[PDB]
Structure 1
Amino acid sequence: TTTLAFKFRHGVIVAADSRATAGAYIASQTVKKVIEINPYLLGTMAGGAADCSFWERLLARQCRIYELRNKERISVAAASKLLANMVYQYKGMGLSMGTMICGWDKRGPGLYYVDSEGNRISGATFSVGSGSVYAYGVMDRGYSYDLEVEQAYDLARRAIYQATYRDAYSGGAVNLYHVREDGWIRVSSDNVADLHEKYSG
């Protein structure tokens, strides 16, 4: 499990792997770990399959009613706060949730990080997962706020590949989304074995 997210001048980049295991047994290789909440919001899956699947679907149930009652989209700081209060009521009962919230706002970009323990922080760069610590170093060596769009696509695609190389619980495919001002857009989805012929060559 390895996800990352970083914002820059032209929006937010979201990338993740697709491998979900069960002990030492790989269950699948085509797990979509970036949950499409809205046409203007995105959420990740990191730690616990049904825990990140249920509560973000319940958050998407809540943000639609907020749009109908007020004739306006929800802000990014609002949706991350509503998710933090729902999980905090089950503190200590044994949940696992480490997702991220992305989306464009009236204040510009938006990037928050929500734990099951109760940590709600903002920031510019994040990397969540078991192989997350392999992704901080290769990202920060190439990170800049004024990167190009095609340059930012190659940075996140490189960083997932180096994480799936060293980690054993990470592999499959590399998904890649791009959050624009109007809404998010799916970039691509590449296999790791196809990148190995490209990068090592």
Structure 2
Amino acid sequence: TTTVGLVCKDGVVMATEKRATMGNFIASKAAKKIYQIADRMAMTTAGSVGDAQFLARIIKIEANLYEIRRERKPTVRAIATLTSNLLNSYRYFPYLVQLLIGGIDSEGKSIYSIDPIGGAIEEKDIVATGSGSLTAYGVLEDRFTPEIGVDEAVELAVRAIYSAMKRDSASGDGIDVVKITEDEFYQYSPEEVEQILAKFRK
């Protein structure tokens, strides 16, 4: 697993690959690791499949209910705080999961990286997660500039996850990307991604 997230001048981008493993056994070539929380909020999951999936459901349901009840969409901060508390409450038998929760809201654009114990770091630009994160961080920290726009940012994301798949046998099989602009919450589809990494080597 490897997922990235970058805050651009015009939005937010998040991406992940599709591999799920249990040791060296490749259990899945198409695991879902990117979830939609709100209209302009996404979440990427790295860690225990069962734990992540479980938590994802909770997160969604609570974001929904929040809106339906208060007639206001929850801010990423609210969802991040919510999730942190939940995670930390289980600090003595934590959910082995590394979350990325971000998007656009009344407060602006932001991304939060949250660990098993509910430690949340507010990402003001670049972030990678998963067994491949360190390689991904390589290119991200090389080519990123705050003025980057979401459109080239998705290329950068695919670029980084592509590198990581080359040195992390736990990553790979393909890549999902998501752009969160404001006028939209877009998900690229295999075709479009396959054509974006085509300008690379595969």
TM-score (norm 1): 0.91
Query: What is the aligned length?
Result: 201
Partner of 2:167: 166
Q: Say whether the 8 Å CA contact 2:16–2:161 is kept in structure 1.
A: yes
The CA deviation at 1:56 is: 2.1
Structure 2 residue ranges without an equivalent (≥5): none
Separation of aligned partners in 2, 1:36 and 1:134: 26
- Tell me by how many angstroms 1:187 deviates: 2.3
User: Could you give the per-residue CA deviations for residues 153-178 of structure 1, whole angstroms, max 9, x where no partner exists?
Assistant: 22111111100011111110111100
In structure 1, the partner of 2:188 is: 187
Matches within 5 A, 1:1-201: 1-124=1-124, 125-189=126-190, 198-200=199-201
1:95-136 per-position Cα deviation (integer Å, ceiling 9, x unaligned): 201011011111211211111122112022110000110011
For 2:20 and 2:107, locate their aligned partners in 1 and report how far apart those are by CA, in whole Å: 35
Query: Which secondary structure state, in structure 2, belongs to the residue aligned with residue 110 of structure 1?
Result: strand
TM-score (norm 2): 0.91
Q: 1:64 to 1:22 in 2, by over 3 A?
A: same
Distance 1:196 1:59 in 2: 31
Alignment identity in percent?
32
Give the alignment's Cα RMSD to 1 decimal. 2.2
More moved, 8-17 vs 58-67: 58-67
Letter paired with 2:95: L
2:112 is paired with a residue of what secondary structure?
A: strand
Tell whether the 8 Å contact from 2:8 to 2:149 is kept in structure 1 after alignment: no
Gaps of 5+ in 1: none
1:61-83 Cα distance to aligned partner (Å, 9 max, x none): 11222112221111110000001
| d(CA) in 2 for partners of 1:115, 1:60 | 18
Q: What one-letter code is carried by the residue in structure 2 that aligns with 1:165? A: K
